[PDB]
Amino acid sequence: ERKRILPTWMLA
Amino acid sequence: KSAVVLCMDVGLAMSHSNQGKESPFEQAKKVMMLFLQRQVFAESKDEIAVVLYGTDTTDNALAREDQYENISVHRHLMLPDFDLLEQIENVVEPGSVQADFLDALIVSMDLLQKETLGKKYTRLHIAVFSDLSSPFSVDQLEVIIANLKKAEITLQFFLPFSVDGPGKGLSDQQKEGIEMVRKIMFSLDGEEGLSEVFTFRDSLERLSI
Secondary structure (H helix, E strand, O other): OOOOOOOHHHHO | OOEEEEEEEOOHHHHOOOOOOOOHHHHHHHHHHHHHHHHHHOOOOOEEEEEEEOOOOOEOOOOEOOEOOOEEEEEEEEOOOHHHHHHHHHHOOOOOOOOOHHHHHHHHHHHHHHHOOOOOOOOEEEEEEOOOOOOOOOOOHHHHHHHHHHOOEEEEEEEOOOOOOOOOOOOHHHHHHHHHHHHHHHHHHHHHHHOOEEEHHHHHHHHOO
């Protein structure tokens, strides 16, 4: 599966 | 006032004209224009952004090597105006590529997260218009859903076909997209959430609700 990088605020 | 993102698929498949007089791209653009005209003429205070996915160029805050490609923020979260109407009518054209709708959803969420900071809204809303022809990755979808819930964002999907007579020749990819939409809406709102999946034919009135 293609990996995406979520913006930091979504990982808080 | 509400904050709304119109998240519009302009990918190549949307340009294929084989239903009635207008392609899905033309139909979706028409709904967008009618909605924006209603909002302008009514002097609504809702703020309306426009995110396009499937565009040949890339223009968004998350774009980097191999990430959030072919997604363009055409209008930020602002009151609509006639410049926007003119801008949409004459500029917004079909793309020649496809893009990942969950990437477009994330760009739309990030736009809302940043541009609603410190202000009060009645609701935050993302309306997706698409034929679901493009591939997508489900990587970290559980985090997307968690953040939709945390931010209390409501989601609506509009498709140029019904998903409930003859079959309509939907591809396996479109059927996978339909199922993923159902999984997302059920995750957000249970059974009642599946009812948030509509046709282009019904979209103009469902937006205004």
